[PDB]
Structure formats: C-alpha cells, structure tokens
Symmetry: C3
Subunit: 333 residues, 3 copies
C-alpha cells in the first residue's frame, strides 16, 4: 500500500517563515519526507547579553513549521550529530501511539532514526523533544515546534465557505527559566550539563525569567517585523509547548480564530484576545484594513513588555478615515 | 457622509452601574459622543489602609462602561488636566488601526484630544491606557475599562431567539502589584513617579498582591452588594485587561455565556465557571430563581478569599423547595 | 409530588473508579440517595514522605464521583463524626441556591444533615467544602470532588448521534501548598489547626508545592495505571476546584471534549490539549487505537514532571503500522 504512494522531499525554512505548500491539495495522499538535525547551541536571549544553552531542532527556536495534508504519511529522518552531548527524541501531538513517537525516536549523539506516522486529524499541533526524566528541561530549553495538518480542501469559515490566506507566519512563544545568583544576576554555564541541577531548581518556581517570540527579546521587531499590505489575508500560527498564552494583535482582531487549533471545529469570530493552553498550537486569520505598525503581543502586558513577548507587524497601504480618524489632534486646553 | 449623521451626547455613570441605552436599536447609525477626564489619585485598596497612586479614566477603577450599537461611530473627547503628572493615552480593542487609537491620543498634562472610530464588530471589549514604554504600569495602576458594542437587534441565544436583560452590571477585575519592604509590609509613595522604579520590580514577580473588583477589597459587598429579584434576567459584563480570571456565581450558573465576549458567536450554555483571558471582556446572562445572598467570585479561591476577588449579589423573592431544601437540619448524631 | 417518586440508594466507590449507573436512563426521574462521611486524616503525598492533614469526603482525595440523570433529585446525608476537629459543609456547583447548599449544610464534629436539590442542568460539576472564612484552606486540603448529571438520553456527538463509553475514570487534580522552613524543607504539624496560620501564608504565594492526581505523586502509575484495550471508548472526567489545568493524553487525543463540561453544548473535536478553568469539571472521550503506555498529564510539563501531575494508561492489543512505524530504528550514522 505505502510502497505505491508517491513521495515528495521537502526542505524546511527558518521561523517565522514557512516552507512552500498548497492550501487545497492538488494530489492524492503522499508520503511527505522531512529531515531535521538537532543542534545544541549557546544563544543570547536579551539585550544585556544573557546566554543559555539552547537545545534545538534544526538550529532555531522554535523548530521549523512542517505542513502536510490530512491523511498524508509524514516520514521524518532525525539526526543527532556526535557534536551534541545529550540524548534527544521527538513526540508529535499530531501522531497516534508510542508517546507521540517519543518511545521510537531516542537517539544519542551520533545516531539517527526515521519514523513514519499517518496524519489522521486536521489542525496545527505542537511537536517537542521528551526524553524520559528530563522532559521539562529539553522543552523549556527551546526544543519544540509545530506541524500543520491542512484539510485536503483547505480552510473554511463558520459557514463552510472557503478561506484562503495570502501570507502565513509561524510565531513560536517560549518560556525560559534562567538561574540566578543571590542578587538576581543570571548565571552562565560551560555545557548544557553544568546548568542542569540549577535549571531544575529554577523551573520549580514556576516563574519564567523571559518569555520571547522567535527565541529572543525583540526577535520580531525593527528590521525583523512581520510584513503585510492593507487587503492581505494573513494566517498567524502560534504555539506554546509549556505554558498558557493569550495572543492579541494591537489595532486589529482575530477575524477567525481556532484557539485550540483543530480545523474540524468552526472558528470563533471577531476575537480581541484568545487563550492558547500550554501544550497547544492555535491559528488566527485576519485581513488588514489599515496601514501602519501593529504590536502582536501575549496580553498579560507584564509578560509582553517587561519579559519579551512582543513582536511587530509593518503594514503598507492607504489610511481609511471612515474606520478611524483623529478629530482633534492633541493640543493644550 | 458623517456630516449628515445624527449625534447624541452620553453622560457616563460610575461602575458597577451602566449609562442608559436601548438593547434593540430604534434609530439608524449615529455618532455617539463621550467625554472622559483622566484623574491620577491616591486610593486605599484594603482594610489595613494600603494606599496606591491610581491612574484612572473618569476617577474610577475600572473606567466606566460605554455602550453603543454595531456600526455607530464613537467620538471620544479625552482630557488630561494640568493637575496630572503623567502623559496618558487610550487604546480601544473595539477599534481598527493606530494601535487601537493609542498612537493618535497621547496627551500630556494640560492637553486634550478627540478621536473617532467606527464600531464594526459586535461584542464587549477592553479599552486601556498604553503609553510607549510604560504600558503595564498604567494598566495595572487601574487605567482600563470596557466598551459594549451591541448588535442592532440586541442579544440572541444559541438558536437565534432573543435575549433581553432586565438589569446589567459591570465588574472590572484588577490585579495590583504593591511594593513591599523586607518584612512584607507594603510601601507608600509621595507621587506616582516615586513609585515607578519599585513598581517595575514588583510586576516582574508576576504575583499580584491584591486582585479586587471595583477597585478595593470588599467594594461590592455589604451595603454595596449587587441587587436583583427572583425572575430577573441579569447580564454581568466582566473584564480583566492583564490577567486571566474564571468568574463563578456561587449558588447560580451562567445560563448563557460569551467567555471571550464576541456576540457573532453562539453562547455556551449552563456554565459553572468560565475563563476570561487577560486582555478581554466577557458577558454572562442568568435568570435568578432563588432568593438570598450569592457570592460572585474569581474561582481561584485563594485569589477570591485571600486576595480580594469576591463580590455579592442580594436577591429578593420566595424560596423554591422543589429546587433545594434542607431535609434534615444540622443536628447531633 | 416527591413523596411519590421512586428512591434508590447508591453506594459510592473510590476514585479513579465510578459507581455503577446507566448512560441512557431506563426509569423516569427518581430521588437518588447518597451518604458521605467526612474524614480528617494525615496523608503522605510524595516519595520523600511529606505529610499533610487532608480534609476529605469519604476518605479520599478527590471525594468520590456521584452520577445521576438530569431532573433526578439528589438527596445527600452528610456526616461529620466527633473524631474530626473542624466544622465542614458542602457546595454543589450543580445546585441552585443557598451557596450551592453551603449555607444549609454546616456541621460541626458530631453532627449530620441531609440536603436535597434538583439536578436541573446536565454536565459534570465540581462540589467542594466551603466554610465561611476558611474556604481556600478546606479546598486546597483536598476537600472537593465532582458530580456528573447525564442527559436522560446519554451523551451525543457534534451531530446529535449517540456516544456510548465502555469505561469511565475520574481524575481529580489537586494543588497543595505545603509550608516550608528557611531552607525549603516542608513542615509537619500535629493537628490541622496547628498548620492553619502557616497554611494561609503558603497559599498567598500562589505557587503550589505539589500538584497531583488521586492525592499523591505517582498515585495513577505502575500497578495503579488506568487500563483499557485498543477499540474501547473511554470517558475521562477531570476536575480542578481551585486552579486551571490543561490535560493531554500523550500519544492520543481527545476525540470529543467538553472542556468546561456542560453537555447541552456540542463537544470540541480532535483536541491535543484543552483548558479546564479552576473551579470546573471537564470530560474527554477517546477510542484507543494503539496499545502500549500513554502518559496522561497536565501539559505545563514542569507541573506534570517536577510537581506530580502525571498518570498512566496501560493499553492492550495489536500495534497498527499504518498509523505509526519506526522505519529505521536508532542506529549510528
Ligand atoms: Cu532534547
Ligand atoms: Cu506534549
Ligand atoms: Cu495612563
Ligand atoms: Cu490591549
Ligand atoms: Cu471542610
Ligand atoms: Cu465553588
């Protein structure tokens, strides 16, 4: 049966971008092949130079977004080069059995494996590393991403009518727990292993020290802001593998939102803010109507503005005064 | 086009009460005019006399509830008198563009401005002050409220049949982060500005010191309990601009609830408790069937009973023994 | 009217098991009689021997699951033996009036009472002890459970077609706040009353020290894992009386989920993880398709793997390679 299926290899792209794909499937089911290489690396997360030992899928935090269609077979080759120091694996929330694939994919430095699973349910899901006994440590070290299983007929609105996006972006949100000395200064370690005993004590406080998009404070800003034009329909996929978040587009809305990200359910309309539970991927669809800067934020504003969970959208086009206008510009009484 | 629209000025009321309005619109679209005056003021939040420098819209925490209909134009005159010390602005989640209006409404002490925006989506939304760089500080200092954009045909149930409330109350829930000395005693400051550096350190712990309804512990109790009669249909609007909450009416239910508060979506029925994400306004509809006291609470009971998130409803009428009765009153075995 | 109703006494069972009942009602409305005995007891919660003074309904944490049908009358006899030290009561979220029954059921050691209430709304609800002024203390000491009010025609899917479970399990999740000395070692007390003043300070930090299923770390594991076979439809009821949780079946899904647990609403399909707000009971329905171990967890992984919120499912049957298969077993590059 599988022997007879057509096969296509896909080369992944770095978040927030997403590899090429078709919204509506033009072919029948296939075996979609992906290759990921694990990379343990030092990463600076804030302006002051705080450094950590990140554990990554393909070298980025979050890992890249995989996109397939319902009933395709996902075939993943997972390599753990000998330059890494730790055993890793992968658990796909989109998969059925063997702990999401975690029990079948344990690779020490120097090994590789190939897992295949059928994508039976449509929606966006989280995938994350989950080695027995050190699960929260690898996940909160940035070792998680997401996979999108699109219905073979693409997205649909509250009424069964089609929704087609022009642009798609992947925002992976990450809670980091950096050990601190007695004064509150962050600690630095030589190897991931040296940080371990202190990492566990830091996590039990349950209070992240940083919460960031795309692996660092200010990663999606300035020359890195997300882009769009008035009139474009944009799909933003957002994932949180460990902790709850509440995304909000400042100056915009979520016209159609799947908060818990499962496409067999109808979307919720006109959301100002929506809750994505820890361990879940969500998707919101919005059509830009006004140009300018928009702040995309986790709406606990302390987590957004003090801890790092804020990104930007830079949108081009003409201003519409019917929708909003300054009748009287700020001036002295 | 707007030139030709009828205009009505509306005078706001202090929470938990709501200004007069029509559920079903009897007129066509209009320009609804409101005036708000910012007031920086000291406010005592608990029984022991803990005092803070509140930043308010119209002098209350939360700011007053504005009520309009879908497709009306909201025209707001925002004044920042010279007696205030800080720059403030306003971001409406109900609005499209310019950071919810935040980028068009920056007023230093002594200035005023007038913003107009079209209310294109029906539902209850949060509005809050959001000055660049000091956003969480103004929001958690009590500078937020909500606006309700009613469908021109009023509210509807899960089946498209009408829902008409007899009473409406606005409960604004607020998380406060009061600085403490080494022993845990709360600090006091001369001006809002003196508190700033300590305010930021207190917020980063992410642990509120107080969580209250209507600006103080016990604000909606005793002689201030909300009132109703068995048989009245009551709509309770609840908002949390920064942090998640889970309202629950002890001894009652949410017969129809819009947790994320957007009226184009059907309500959820028979809720015991519902989640309102930080940065959102929700509405629950309930018809009283039994008289007596009811406690309205944030269902994390530590936040409710130790931190201040508890209010009361005092309901009049006859007891119904079919629904509940004490078969055997407490007595010795 | 009630005089004329048939009556059936039901003997409760210890979680995670559930007393015998019919999904579809074969009789008309009845008065269902239950008896619960309160038991204050020492309980060891973790591997290192941490001990607390648990306050329980029937001697277990959580209290047992009661199962009735919509419009039945629940008649509860609640006994507080003279061996207990504290006053207790009971508030049913499924009930209408008198604070969920809390105001009618206050019993000091040595007393008993019998309350009757009509179960007018279908769904799973939380019940918990709630004495005036010491509410969070009794709830977080393990004094809560849940009651399931089934539609007289049983469960239904998104389309009105029937859903019948073969097995049902009740998982009660509990947040504990154990006082600690200056080094972080947990404290021990002689009586519940001795712990009180320290219990209140521990709760205000809002950071649980333990979060467990069925009253202890590892309670649902090993020889205590939940069991099923490939092909069985399993309903898992989960409750959290004080704090939010996000259940997730590792290697599985929630095929149909009522997150806020109210059966008049349609279920959400294909969930990877769902949010149950503090103060609520939820239910997820899943049909096993692969054999092996599954981890059932609260998806904040630090709460799951460091704090105790993890249980197991041991499932029998044949592996299906169409759904998942290891193409290349881990081996050296
Ligand atoms: Cu790993
Ligand atoms: Cu997971
Ligand atoms: Cu302000
Ligand atoms: Cu906002
Ligand atoms: Cu009790
Ligand atoms: Cu309760």
């Amino acid at each position: 049966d599988i022997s007879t299926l057509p096969r296509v290899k896909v080369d992944l792209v770095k978040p927030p971008f997403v590899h090429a794909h078709d919204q509506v499937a033009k072919t029948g089911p296939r075996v979609v092949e992906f290759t990921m290489t694990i990379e343990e690396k030092k990463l600076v997360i804030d302006r002051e130079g705080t450094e950590i030992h990140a554990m990554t899928f393909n070298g980025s935090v979050p890992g890249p977004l995989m996109v397939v269609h319902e009933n395709d077979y996902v075939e993943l080759r997972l390599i753990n080069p000998d330059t890494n120091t730790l055993l890793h694996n992968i658990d796909f929330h989109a998969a059925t059995g063997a702990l999401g694939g975690g029990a079948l994919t344990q690779v020490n430095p120097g090994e590789e494996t190939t897992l295949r699973f059928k994508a039976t349910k449509p929606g966006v899901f989280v995938y994350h590393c989950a080695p027995e006994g050190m699960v929260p440590w690898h996940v909160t070290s940035g070792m998680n991403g997401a996979i999108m299983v699109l219905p073979r007929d693409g997205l649909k609105d509250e009424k069964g009518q089609p929704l087609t996006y022009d642009k798609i972006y992947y925002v992976g949100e990450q809670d980091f727990y950096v050990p601190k000395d007695e004064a509150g200064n962050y600690k630095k370690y030589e190897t991931p292993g040296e940080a371990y005993e202190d990492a566990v004590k830091a996590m039990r406080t349950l209070t992240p020290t940083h919460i960031v998009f795309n692996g660092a404070v200010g990663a999606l800003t300035g020359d890195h802001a997300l882009t769009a034009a008035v009139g474009e329909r944009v799909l933003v996929v957002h994932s949180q593998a460990n902790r709850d978040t509440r995304p909000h587009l400042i100056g915009g809305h979520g016209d159609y939102v799947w908060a818990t990200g499962k496409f067999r359910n109808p979307p919720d309309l006109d959301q100002e803010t929506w809750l994505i539970p820890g361990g879940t991927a969500g998707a919101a669809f919005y059509t830009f109507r006004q140009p300018g800067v928009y702040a995309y934020v986790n709406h606990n504003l302390i987590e957004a503005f003090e801890l790092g969970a804020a990104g930007h959208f830079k949108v081009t086009g003409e201003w519409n005064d019917d929708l909003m206008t300054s009748v009287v510009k700020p001036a002295s009484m």
